[PDB]
Amino acid sequence: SQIPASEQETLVRPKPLLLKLLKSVGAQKDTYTMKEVLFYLGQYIMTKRLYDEKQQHIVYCSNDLLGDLFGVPSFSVKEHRKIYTMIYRNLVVVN
Ligand X SMILES: COc1ccccc1-n1nc2c(c1C(C)C)[C@H](c1ccc(Cl)cc1C)N(c1cc(Cl)ccc1OCCN(C)C)C2=O
Residue 7 binds which of ligand X, Cl ion, none (CB < 5-8 A, kind-dependent)? none
Say if CB 26 and CB 36 are below 8 A apart: yes
Among 46, 92, 93, 94, binds ligand X (CB under 6 A): 46
Does residue 65 bind Cl ion (CB under 5 A)? yes
Q: Residue 88 binds which one of Cl ion, ligand X, none, with CB within 5 to 8 A depending on kind?
A: none
Residue 77 makes contact with ligand X by CB under 6 A? yes
Binding of residue 93 to ligand X (CB under 6 A): no
Residue 65: name its binding partner from Cl ion, ligand X, none (Cβ under 5 to 8 Å by kind): Cl ion
Question: Which ranges in 1-95 belong to alpha helices (H)?
Answer: 16-22, 34-47, 65-70, 80-88
- Enumerate residues 6+ apart whose C-beta is below 8 A from 4: none
DSSP 3-state of 91: strand
